[PDB]
Amino acid sequence: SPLAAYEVDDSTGYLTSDVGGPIQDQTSLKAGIRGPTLLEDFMFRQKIQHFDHERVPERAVHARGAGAHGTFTSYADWSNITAASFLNATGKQTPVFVRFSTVAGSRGSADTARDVHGFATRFYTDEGNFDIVGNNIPVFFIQDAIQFPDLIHSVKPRPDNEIPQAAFAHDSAWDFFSQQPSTMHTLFWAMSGHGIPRSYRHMDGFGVHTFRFVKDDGSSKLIKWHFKSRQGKASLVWEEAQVLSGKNADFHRQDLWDAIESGNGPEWDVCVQIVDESQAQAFGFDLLDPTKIIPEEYAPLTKLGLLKLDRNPTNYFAETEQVMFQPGHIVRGIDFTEDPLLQGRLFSYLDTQLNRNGGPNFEQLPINMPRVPIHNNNRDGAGQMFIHRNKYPYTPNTLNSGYPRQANQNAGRGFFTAPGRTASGALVREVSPTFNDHWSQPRLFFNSLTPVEQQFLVNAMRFEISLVKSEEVKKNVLTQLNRVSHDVAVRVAAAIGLGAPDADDTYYHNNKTAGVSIVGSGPLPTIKTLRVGILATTSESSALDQAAQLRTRLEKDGLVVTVVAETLREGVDQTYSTADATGFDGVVVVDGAAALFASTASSPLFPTGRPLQIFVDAYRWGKPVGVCGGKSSEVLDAADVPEDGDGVYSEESVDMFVEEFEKGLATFRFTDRFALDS
Amino acid sequence: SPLAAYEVDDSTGYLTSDVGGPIQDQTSLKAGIRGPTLLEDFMFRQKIQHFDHERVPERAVHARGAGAHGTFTSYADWSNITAASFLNATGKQTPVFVRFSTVAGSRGSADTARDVHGFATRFYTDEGNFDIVGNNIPVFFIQDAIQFPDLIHSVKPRPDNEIPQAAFAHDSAWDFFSQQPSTMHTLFWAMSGHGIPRSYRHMDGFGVHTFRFVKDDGSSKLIKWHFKSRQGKASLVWEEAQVLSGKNADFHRQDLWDAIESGNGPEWDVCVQIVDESQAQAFGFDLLDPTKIIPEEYAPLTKLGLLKLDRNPTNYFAETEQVMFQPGHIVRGIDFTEDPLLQGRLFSYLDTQLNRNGGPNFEQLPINMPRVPIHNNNRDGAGQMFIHRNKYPYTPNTLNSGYPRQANQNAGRGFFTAPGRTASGALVREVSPTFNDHWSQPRLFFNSLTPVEQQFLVNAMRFEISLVKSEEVKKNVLTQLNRVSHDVAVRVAAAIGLGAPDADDTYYHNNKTAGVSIVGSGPLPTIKTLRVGILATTSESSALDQAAQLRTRLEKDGLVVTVVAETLREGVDQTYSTADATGFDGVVVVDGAAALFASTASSPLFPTGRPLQIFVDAYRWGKPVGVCGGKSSEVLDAADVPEDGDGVYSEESVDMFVEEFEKGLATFRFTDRFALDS
Numbered sequence A, B: 001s002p003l004a005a006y007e008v009d010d011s012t013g014y015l016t017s018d019v020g021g022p023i024q025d026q027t028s029l030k031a032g033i034r035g036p037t038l039l040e041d042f043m044f045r046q047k048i049q050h051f052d053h054e055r056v057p058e059r060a061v062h063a064r065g066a067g068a069h070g071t072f073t074s075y076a077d078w079s080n081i082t083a084a085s086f087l088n089a090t091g092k093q094t095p096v097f098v099r100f101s102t103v104a105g106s107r108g109s110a111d112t113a114r115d116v117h118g119f120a121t122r123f124y125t126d127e128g129n130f131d132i133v134g135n136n137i138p139v140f141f142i143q144d145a146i147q148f149p150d151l152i153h154s155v156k157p158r159p160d161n162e163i164p165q166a167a168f169a170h171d172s173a174w175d176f177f178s179q180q181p182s183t184m185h186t187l188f189w190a191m192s193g194h195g196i197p198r199s200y201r202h203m204d205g206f207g208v209h210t211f212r213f214v215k216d217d218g219s220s221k222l223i224k225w226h227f228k229s230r231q232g233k234a235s236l237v238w239e240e241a242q243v244l245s246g247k248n249a250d251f252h253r254q255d256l257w258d259a260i261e262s263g264n265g266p267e268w269d270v271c272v273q274i275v276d277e278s279q280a281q282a283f284g285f286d287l288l289d290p291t292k293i294i295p296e297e298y299a300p301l302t303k304l305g306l307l308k309l310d311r312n313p314t315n316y317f318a319e320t321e322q323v324m325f326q327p328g329h330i331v332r333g334i335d336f337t338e339d340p341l342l343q344g345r346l347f348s349y350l351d352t353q354l355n356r357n358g359g360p361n362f363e364q365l366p367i368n369m370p371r372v373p374i375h376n377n378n379r380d381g382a383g384q385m386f387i388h389r390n391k392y393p394y395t396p397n398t399l400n401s402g403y404p405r406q407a408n409q410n411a412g413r414g415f416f417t418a419p420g421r422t423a424s425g426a427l428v429r430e431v432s433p434t435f436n437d438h439w440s441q442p443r444l445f446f447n448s449l450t451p452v453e454q455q456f457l458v459n460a461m462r463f464e465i466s467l468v469k470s471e472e473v474k475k476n477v478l479t480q481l482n483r484v485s486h487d488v489a490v491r492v493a494a495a496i497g498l499g500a501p502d503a504d505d506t507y508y509h510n511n512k513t514a515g516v517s518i519v520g521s522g523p524l525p526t527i528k529t530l531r532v533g534i535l536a537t538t539s540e541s542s543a544l545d546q547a548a549q550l551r552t553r554l555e556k557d558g559l560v561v562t563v564v565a566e567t568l569r570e571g572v573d574q575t576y577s578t579a580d581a582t583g584f585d586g587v588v589v590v591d592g593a594a595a596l597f598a599s600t601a602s603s604p605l606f607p608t609g610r611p612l613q614i615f616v617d618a619y620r621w622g623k624p625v626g627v628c629g630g631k632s633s634e635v636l637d638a639a640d641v642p643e644d645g646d647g648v649y650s651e652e653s654v655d656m657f658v659e660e661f662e663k664g665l666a667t668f669r670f671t672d673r674f675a676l677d678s
């Protein structure tokens, strides 16, 4: 409904050309029944011309993603810190569109690659469109926008053969990281669980840069944007992400679509850290440096409002593929800072839409339109939709009585640059020495992870680095890792055949910061939408009965239940042949199906050992697993799963099973199942 | 070579702009060292503009693919059957470029999706570029080019949410196949192992359409192109293909690249079936219908020459992404037929290149250039790279002395339409009744597969169709399947909880045809490039010695050997953490590593049970597997793998192990390991 005016219905009627002439489109016009096709067949050509031109260039980065519509609602009148109109009253609602994404892969690459992720939000405000073009990691790899193509060429596939897809699994990416140590912070983030989130709904959004909030009186404060998930933070484990990439490349986009269709649209509290202009260098780093966070211990979050996504697109291409974000889409009340990464973005996003749209009128696409009137003297250009009535589109004029009028701080609610901003000094292509500590914050982030989480990050490093051919590059990588943590360097080095360099303690410290760990962020606040696979059998009507019973108990609490069996029928959603543990957040075997549970289990209907392997994989990957009905030994012993294990459940009673199992879903992952380096 | 002149060497020198001005590109120009970026920074803007515009539209279909250069060599002077110059002398060599692809997936989609595959070959002939734009399956889904957008919309992701990336795993695709029964032949091919080829090198190429060979005397014959692999035919198994999609999305592009680098460039015999014009309707179907094969029993293959691919591109984007094939790239000695699918293709490929290139001068890209002089009156257009001297580009002229001269059948070796061709009848948008048997050949194909191959095809259909939500679509699928084979329909129906319709014997028959089965095609003629994984341990110096002695022997037979252990070091190529059975065509455990091979082991260096799961997966997927080093069947017992099994090896002596295992690699798959229906 927000784009309802542009909708085209085809639920009735006869086929027409694009100019409304009724036509057919199923057989070519030929010179005889077995003859050649005629050039005069305009039906053919118009249809095939359209087909032939359907594709547009993918985004230069973040090509793989998915989007949805929603609403933002303000918690207060924030005129005490910003003139921004969308934040000017308690309860004030503004429509939004959000696109989530990975970064490196092309538009058909898997959701569950290890990567940084995008979180781009458009507020269609009553004073113009405002975009916050963020990521799920609060810091960036580089400190100057001019370096963006260097970073992106290095992580994207090698350009002789376009291998590999899979940003971290090759020499060039680690060459760049080891030569450009600014990269360490974001690298450590991407090697954590934040690189493989469980869903777009279980990750946060960050503006990354310091921005300014500007009041109507001209005064300014420095801010960081934080969109804090109300679904909780959660990750995949790496092996699971790898399997999912193959079994369901669409996993994150489907998770989002489904959550919305079920009335479980995801929410975030939109927050800021707010600090004075005089605290630009007060926190031990420079707020212009996008490789640093402000620890929450120095600057707490202020909740500004609620973001909720609750309506899927009607046409993906028209809405999600064509949405064209820009940090240049700014509104009165907000300003830029002199972060050199942000500064250059402002150029990039206006220019790149020429590439994608093929012409200058991209703001006229329905998804890009504002929801207020446009008054300016921009004209013409390919694809111009507007029929402008003002035949004197110049300023200054008298022949249009001086309209449109100039808007500025003092009239017309113009945008204005924060008037306290200044520049001083030589015109330079020099990096500020205040940017030079590339290692302290990576150590702060590492120190804030739990032991098992540190292990997972080491293990991701071990996995990726071991795929680098060049022994020199590997050596250079350990030089940098060792500046963050000697222990990381040692542990990584052990997997890859090299010695770590001697400890260099210049940047070592034991400080920690809250709110960055996933494993430490406690049980999820809600288990609605989480997936429970019930493994049953058609060979015992009792097993189906148990499955049906469990289904109703689980569905009542908003879990999404899949009953698996050998073949489909009423009440069974999925065959063993298609099922996989990656499909579930928890796995329950009904004891009527215990006979299936052997690695022995053979059938033309599924691969040998499949039922058991679903259970075993679930267990190995940390998930809650159990057996419902009272008889658990045969299944559990076949799986080599201990009955007294944490997150392993066995009960006859369905109610008591479900009560226990739902606590395990909230815990989400049983990290005691993963080995630690000693 | 038009490509050698445009190669750019950046191995030395200072950075310049695109107009040769030396510059830097690492720091933006700023007003002071913590200041805003300046608009006058041309270094910044030229770099970022280029980045911002790097991407071009992907191909409308066959977006995912990979290419190589090579040579075609004629085996004879074929002037007795065609005027074509590249085929006019024994030993005549012509440069080629080939791109292979899937069909439905975008860029970045995995190579090992179930799909039809492209095999497009450019012959840079001495009489112009000649393209054969083929597929690895000899028949196409539809019988008229006007239906292409219908087919492609139906198999591409649902356009509200762009889900799913798997072409056959959704309702719309099956809706289309069940409403458009022409699709049955290609559908059966795609559900066979030809949907998941082991590599590009292990599949054939087909022109699909009937074409004409035209002699210099104007006479013509009807032909089908067959490019027959000299590597042998081979497939993946489905579960393996799904895992590979996640573990290595680049699997086929890497396989090809690596084969060429190692001097094992792939080969095909370029063959034709040749039949007289009078046989258009002699074989029980119409040669204008691209849903039908001519059985080899009725028309044998004649070998024309050798295709070999032996040089990789220098820059993927410039060469592989930018190659623009067209069936309109035809040469004297070849002509079209009135196949309504081919007829419309001729329009599409010229038009769609305007989309991809953004302008009309795409034939000037080096990869698209010919190898002979161009003489015509085409002029101007965006991106015009030539400086034409002739200032009277019109015919007829006297001001340029009547040049260029018209070329035709008599003068100048012109292309000419086969002079025997005629048309007669009304101008109609009607399908020929001779196209109406949509079911007999699908059954011929199915009858030709071996029993376990028929099971694989049933199982693929069971898998995909079980993912269709609509019970009606499922019913309608069964209706069509049942017209090809009641048994297929019964066996598919059993997996999806419907009953099959009663037998309809109109199109049933028991005929078979040679050369279409993969499982039946016998051992591979070469094992060069095949991958052997040797699972070892760093714990035991015996294990590493055993792996080295095995390696050195296998490597001499052209096998690619990977030694896997817990960590890298001398002699060890890959860690258990990154290893997968999908990485290998055969797996060996050295008996010194026996202690790793339990469902436990446990280590922070790899996931629990990973060593044994590599071996177990390899066995379940049909691969030759064994233990080298004697007396130990502790490994075979932990894996539940029977020592007496075909393709299971156990030998103390490295030489007897290598002799046996090398036979197993040629056999390739041990299909006794897969269960059949009852």
Ligand code: HEM
Binding pocket: A058, A059, A060, A061, A062, A065, A099, A100, A101, A117, A118, A119, A120, A133, A134, A135, A140, A144, A145, A146, A148, A207, A208, A209, A290, A323, A324, A325, A341, A344, A345, A348, A349, A352, A353, A356, B048, B052
């Ligand atoms: C803080 C750093 C950055 C963040 C958080 C970020 C975020 C993102 C996001 C989320 C998208 C996808 C938006 C959508 O979903 O359509 C994107 C696209 C893109 N970004 Fe960035 N970005 C960063 C830095 C850079 C820099 C430094 C440049 C260039 C100098 C750049 C150039 C682009 C380009 C060209 C696109 C494609 C835009 C399109 O086609 O509409 N970004 N960015």
Ligand code: HEM
Binding pocket: A048, A052, B058, B059, B060, B061, B062, B065, B099, B100, B101, B117, B118, B119, B120, B133, B134, B135, B140, B144, B145, B146, B148, B207, B208, B209, B290, B323, B324, B325, B341, B342, B344, B345, B348, B349, B352, B353, B356
């Ligand atoms: C016998 C049936 C067909 C075969 C074997 C076939 C084969 C292929 C191949 C191999 C490619 C990829 C070439 C490359 O690697 O760049 C391709 C691309 C394409 N085909 Fe077809 N095709 C068939 C039918 C059709 C039909 C009926 C149409 C349209 C009416 C069509 C339109 C296209 C388009 C638009 C492209 C993209 C070409 C480009 O951007 O360069 N094809 N085809």
Ligand SMILES: [Ca+2]
Binding pocket: A158, A170, A171, A172, A173
């Ligand atoms: Ca590389």
Ligand SMILES: [Ca+2]
Binding pocket: A192, A193, A194, A235, A236, A453, A456, A518, A519
């Ligand atoms: Ca984690």
Ligand SMILES: [Ca+2]
Binding pocket: A358, B358
């Ligand atoms: Ca254009």
Ligand SMILES: [Ca+2]
Binding pocket: B158, B170, B171, B172, B173
């Ligand atoms: Ca669908």
Ligand SMILES: [Ca+2]
Binding pocket: B415, B416, B417
């Ligand atoms: Ca002619």
